[PDB]
Design a protein around this ligand. Sequence first.
Ligand SMILES: [Zn+2]
Ligand SMILES: [Zn+2]
Lengths: 83, 83
Amino acid sequence: ADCCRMKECCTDRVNECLQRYSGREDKFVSFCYQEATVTCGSFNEIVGCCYGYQMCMIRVVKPNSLSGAHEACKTVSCGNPCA
Amino acid sequence: ADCCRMKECCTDRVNECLQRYSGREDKFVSFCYQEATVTCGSFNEIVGCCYGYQMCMIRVVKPNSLSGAHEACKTVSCGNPCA
Ligand SMILES: [Zn+2]
Ligand SMILES: [Zn+2]
């Protein structure tokens, strides 16, 4: 229904999901992103609920460093939601 | 300093603190709120960084129910920051 609510939900669910993987969070970024786009919905299933956020998190997230990644990536641009 | 940025930092940090307490998160809500106001600061040490949120989380946080509590409580009214 709304791309902006979708973003908010996407970043928050990814972060909450990644806190179940402590020590291993870098391995589960994509797992958590997939779960988040199912939960929050998306306008393109492949793109997901915020693509830019997934890329930022893949680049920044390192083991036992999750919070820093949340603060670094949460305001990043999502990019084209459609393609 | 910005009360609104304070609130955002507060609810996020409380949420992140409580995730170290899986299964027992209800015992640590006030603990985590205090940790959060240390990180995020406050305008009244006794009130903390978002009073309304602390009340909501104390009420709604149950073991293994944290995500449900965050989603419902994060945008809640903080009340008077001064007293
Ligand atoms: Zn955070
Ligand atoms: Zn949440």
